[PDB]
Amino acid sequence: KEEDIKSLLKIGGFATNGQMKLFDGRTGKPFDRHVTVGYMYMLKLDHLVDDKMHARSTGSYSLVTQQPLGGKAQFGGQRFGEMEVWALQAYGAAYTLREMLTVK
Amino acid sequence: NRVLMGANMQRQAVPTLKSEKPLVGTGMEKIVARDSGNCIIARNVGEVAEVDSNRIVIKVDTEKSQTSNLVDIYSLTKFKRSNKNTCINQRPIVNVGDKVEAGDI
Amino acid sequence: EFTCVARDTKLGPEEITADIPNVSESSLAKLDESGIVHIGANVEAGDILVAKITPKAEQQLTPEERLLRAIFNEKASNVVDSSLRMPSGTSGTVINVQVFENDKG
Amino acid sequence: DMPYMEDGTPVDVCLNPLGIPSRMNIGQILEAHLGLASYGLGKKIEKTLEKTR
Amino acid sequence: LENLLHPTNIKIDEYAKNATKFSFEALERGVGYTLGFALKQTMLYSIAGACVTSIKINDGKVTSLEDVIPCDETVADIILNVKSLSVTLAEDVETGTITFELSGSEEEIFSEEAKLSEGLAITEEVFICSYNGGKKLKIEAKVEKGVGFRPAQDNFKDGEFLLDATFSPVVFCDFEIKDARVGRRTDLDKLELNIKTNGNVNCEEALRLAATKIQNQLRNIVDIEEINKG
Amino acid sequence: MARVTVEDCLDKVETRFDLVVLASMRANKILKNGYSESMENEKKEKATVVALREIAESEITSEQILRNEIEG
Amino acid sequence: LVERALGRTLAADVVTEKGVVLLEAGTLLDENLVELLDDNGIDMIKVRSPITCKTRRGLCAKCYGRDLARERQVNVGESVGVIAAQSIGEPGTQLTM
Amino acid sequence: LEFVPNIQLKEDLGAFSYKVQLSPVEKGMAHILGNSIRRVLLSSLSGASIIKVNIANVLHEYSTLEDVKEDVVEIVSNLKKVAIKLDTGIDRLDLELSVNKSGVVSAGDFKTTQGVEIINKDQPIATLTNQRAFSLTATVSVGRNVGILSAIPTELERVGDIAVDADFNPIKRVAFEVFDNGDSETLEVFVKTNGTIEPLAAVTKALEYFCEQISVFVSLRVP
Amino acid sequence: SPASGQPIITPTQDIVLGLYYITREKEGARGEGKLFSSYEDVSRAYNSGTIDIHAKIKLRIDRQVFDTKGNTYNEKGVVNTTVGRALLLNILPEGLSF
Ligand SMILES: [Zn+2]
Known part of the structure; x- marks a missing residue:
């Protein structure tokens, strides 16, 4: 419970808070309003960035339909799905919608 | 709703080079690891014979243990892969000539 | 962990021997005398791990290809290499090389 | 560049405070308090041990 | 042993009356911040000079900011006008006294008025107020000199509206950092300063004067002499 | 957005759509005129923005622009 | 009213309860003119809804009013149907009960 | 009206902790020297x-x-x-x-x-x-x-x-404090290193670097 | 936003905290009731570290203001403001009222 944490903090030689006074590292002039500090165990998750970058210029194509592949395993090709078509419609962006459907 | 994610997340956590014990635990990490075959629990009580980072040798004092063989071995597993491409390797703790018991790490 | 395989196609046997034209002894430098990388070579993003070749046919090459064969005396090789290379964006080193041979031979 | 306590030690991570109240995961705060405490108790033993082993 | 780089590129630019924008290029990472802080602070608060401090209007017969006077401007306006006068003292003297004793007929008032004491130089022709030819009026200004920012505790203590001290010609620093590249290493710094002074000294040479202060504060621990050679 | 924007151009031409087509015609014209002599496109901007600048400074008066299509 | 009918053009004129006309037919409202509605005590007017346009298989640039996204009368070529469609179900992910 | 500091290695202690000092300063310049010392001491020493x-x-x-x-x-x-x-x-x-x-x-x-x-x-x-x-x-x-x-x-x-x-970089901690002495102040810098250099040499080196970097603004020329 | 004329790029989470914080007031603070001519004065002062940013001061301003009907009338005088708010005086473009 709280007061136990607090007795321990006192034993350590800290305020009966978590809060303490800090100084910037670019000047040295302190911040007002004493700030909290602590230890706070932290983890790294298996969602690294090395395996989500995946750009593509030109690569293989689908056998039965002649369209790019997908998934970054072969060479991907980002799905320009249906809902993104209504967007380019509402903009009235005819050209960029046309050659998004043939030349690409 | 927040603890749901806090639990679903700490099982995708990726191990790292040098393990560092938590400083605010719940006395349960002593149980999970022990209760999964990633550690090497000594079968019989004795003394360390000779340890190196490939295997461990334990001579067992038969006086206080049931009929035994006076020596058993444990083979370590260095850098064995695992389904997510993560490195697995056990590292010995004990030193030469230490008193250990049945059910220790 | 990568793995390359060699099959028996209807034009002949494909080969993993470290002998493929259009390839210098520099990209081949990190290759041993058997078509397989050493154990220790810090491979790079796009170097050969095992070098293979497969035969082909039916060229009937274009007139311009014919001319340029006929200028530098460029012969038309009947084989094509399909080696095994680390995909781009990766690095590292090697720690184990398992090789499984043929049967009944 | 990081902010640093008066002693001289710097701070590793700079989380954001606006998160905690709205999504009421308070327990993280109390974890930071207990952690600070443990880290103080560490330095104490260190001081007693930097002399007279 | 890789020879910490040097700026090697300067682009000075003036854009207003007493204002200039200097920009320096290709400084090692993070150095920009330190060199900005030092520059700004010392150029702002540790330069010698003289500046007005106190105002007494009718020998004490104006107490607060809500007392009519026979001119177009309330007391606050006159205080604000006079507080801006750019005065250059003399080394021999250590105090000035500007006196705007006036009884005319609805005139325009400027610095070319105001019988002074010795050692002063008003340096400008800033406008003050517009007389109304009404009843008598007087203005007494006190002038001191030194360095630093001397804060005034109280506003109007006894019979003088007290102000705080600037003691500097430099009125604005406002530096900033951006990014720049010198090739394969692109994490470097590019600084931009924006100084605006009062007129007592052109901006750049004031900058140089503030840098000399620092580079002079180490002669006993460094060799400021050989660093010039290069 | 280096210097000029749609808010500028929208004062002379209108509906912000006509802008697109007119600027596209003008940039195509400026492109096919061999402006690509390659000692300039590395010191200044692409024609796609040169056309916008030209329409903003009110130099061309797009009423004129179309009269360059009959010049095709 | 002065918020419900902002930026929508007026079908017909509007007569003061004292007799003089105030705003004419075909007069797109605007936060200047929309003072002149709560000013003189008005509480009902006739505006041009797209339900009551007269063009075939389309829409005129007045029965729709202000673009409500660039603060001008709607330019000719704005596909209004799609905008109105996805500006209805979009907030729907939040309205629950 | 002339103050100039000299450097002193007062108050050694601990494993490799020290408290270096510069005795007279300019009454306002102290907090500049402190920050400059700290940052350059934490980033460039080789x-x-x-x-x-x-x-x-x-x-x-x-x-x-x-x-x-x-x-x-x-x-x-x-x-x-x-x-x-x-x-x-x-x-x-x-x-x-x-x-x-x-x-x-x-x-x-x-x-x-x-x-x-x-x-x-x-x-x-x-x-x-x-x-x-x-x-x-x-x-x-x-x-x-x-x-x-x-x-x-x-x-x-x-x-x-x-x-x-x-x-x-052999520096592990830096922290400063500024004390007033009347028209004059004294700077009191904490340093802790691994023992691979001596403190006085260290701070002198850092100030050398710093003034070397400043020495362009005395010229307002290229180099 | 196309859905409704309300803007969509307004500061959101702690861009709002800082603004709301430096734009409050306090009764007994340092430098209270002082006098300043222009924004640069308040900047120079505040960087010196004597005033509390929540203090009440008096600033004399002078700038154009756009009326509803396309006019643009001049505004001047002395206004009782706070040390914080004056720091935002620089960013407000000429055309909007203080
Ligand atoms: Zn219609």
Whole structure:
């Protein structure tokens, strides 16, 4: 419970808070309003960035339909799905919608 | 709703080079690891014979243990892969000539 | 962990021997005398791990290809290499090389 | 560049405070308090041990 | 042993009356911040000079900011006008006294008025107020000199509206950092300063004067002499 | 957005759509005129923005622009 | 009213309860003119809804009013149907009960 | 009206902690010197460290020798925490280590060649459970930290070479405080290092760097 | 936003905290009731570290203001403001009222 944490903090030689006074590292002039500090165990998750970058210029194509592949395993090709078509419609962006459907 | 994610997340956590014990635990990490075959629990009580980072040798004092063989071995597993491409390797703790018991790490 | 395989196609046997034209002894430098990388070579993003070749046919090459064969005396090789290379964006080193041979031979 | 306590030690991570109240995961705060405490108790033993082993 | 780089590129630019924008290029990472802080602070608060401090209007017969006077401007306006006068003292003297004793007929008032004491130089022709030819009026200004920012505790203590001290010609620093590249290493710094002074000294040479202060504060621990050679 | 924007151009031409087509015609014209002599496109901007600048400074008066299509 | 009918053009004129006309037919409202509605005590007017346009298989640039996204009368070529469609179900992910 | 500071090594204490002092200052310039000292002392000071190692019967980092409680990568991590001191103009050389003992191989067992220095004499490098041979080298090099990005991968030549990343800057903590003495102040700088340099030399070096960087604004010319 | 004329790029989470914080007031603070001519004065002062940013001061301003009907009338005088708010005086473009 709280007061136990607090007795321990006192034993350590800290305020009966978590809060303490800090100084910037670019000047040295302190911040007002004493700030909290602590230890706070932290983890790294298996969602690294090395395996989500995946750009593509030109690569293989689908056998039965002649369209790019997908998934970054072969060479991907980002799905320009249906809902993104209504967007380019509402903009009235005819050209960029046309050659998004043939030349690409 | 927040603890749901806090639990679903700490099982995708990726191990790292040098393990560092938590400083605010719940006395349960002593149980999970022990209760999964990633550690090497000594079968019989004795003394360390000779340890190196490939295997461990334990001579067992038969006086206080049931009929035994006076020596058993444990083979370590260095850098064995695992389904997510993560490195697995056990590292010995004990030193030469230490008193250990049945059910220790 | 990568793995390359060699099959028996209807034009002949494909080969993993470290002998493929259009390839210098520099990209081949990190290759041993058997078509397989050493154990220790810090491979790079796009170097050969095992070098293979497969035969082909039916060229009937274009007139311009014919001319340029006929200028530098460029012969038309009947084989094509399909080696095994680390995909781009990766690095590292090697720690184990398992090789499984043929049967009944 | 990081902010640093008066002693001289710097701070590793700079989380954001606006998160905690709205999504009421308070327990993280109390974890930071207990952690600070443990880290103080560490330095104490260190001081007693930097002399007279 | 890789020879910490040097700026090697300067682009000075003036854009207003007493204002200039200097920009320096290709400084090692993070150095920009330190060199900005030092520059700004010392150029702002540790330069010698003289500046007005106190105002007494009718020998004490104006107490607060809500007392009519026979001119177009309330007391606050006159205080604000006079507080801006750019005065250059003399080394021999250590105090000035500007006196705007006036009884005319609805005139325009400027610095070319105001019988002074010795050692002063008003340096400008800033406008003050517009007389109304009404009843008598007087203005007494006190002038001191030194360095630093001397804060005034109280506003109007006894019979003088007290102000705080600037003691500097430099009125604005406002530096900033951006990014720049010198090739394969692109994490470097590019600084931009924006100084605006009062007129007592052109901006750049004031900058140089503030840098000399620092580079002079180490002669006993460094060799400021050989660093010039290069 | 280096210097000029749609808010500028929208004062002379209108509906912000006509802008697109007119600027596209003008940039195509400026492109096919061999402006690509390659000692300039590395010191200044692409024609796609040169056309916008030209329409903003009110130099061309797009009423004129179309009269360059009959010049095709 | 002065918020419900902002930026929508007026079908017909509007007569003061004292007799003089105030705003004419075909007069797109605007936060200047929309003072002149709560000013003189008005509480009902006739505006041009797209339900009551007269063009075939389309829409005129007045029965729709202000673009409500660039603060001008709607330019000719704005596909209004799609905008109105996805500006209805979009907030729907939040309205629950 | 003339104050100029001199530097003094008052108040040593602790493992390698100190409190350097500059006695008179200009009444306002103190808090500039403090910040400049701190930052430049934390970013640019160069030292020496191990960068590349070759062990005897090894081929790569994920391996294991016989009769060694340690691993190869654990050994490589041990090596990183050695505090080396080099003299003026060495800038590169080689260290050697060959032993045939049966205990704990501390870093003191490096060969006591000229020029070099090994302060961290207690640090274990490896533990030999049984008596055996053991040998390696490690190229010590001067250097300074630059960031995780602009670091070259330190080309390797031989077969068993194993790159070791190197933390150069020998400073671990800095903190200042400014005291008033009446028309004058005194600066009181805390420093803590690994022992590979002396404090007075350190602060002098940092101020040298700093004024060197300032010396352009006295000119408002290119260089 | 196309859905409704309300803007969509307004500061959101702690861009709002800082603004709301430096734009409050306090009764007994340092430098209270002082006098300043222009924004640069308040900047120079505040960087010197004597005033509390929540203090009440008096600033004399002078700038154009756009009326509803396309006019643009001049505005001047002395206004009782706070040290914080004056720091935002620089960013407000000429055309909007203080
Ligand atoms: Zn209609």
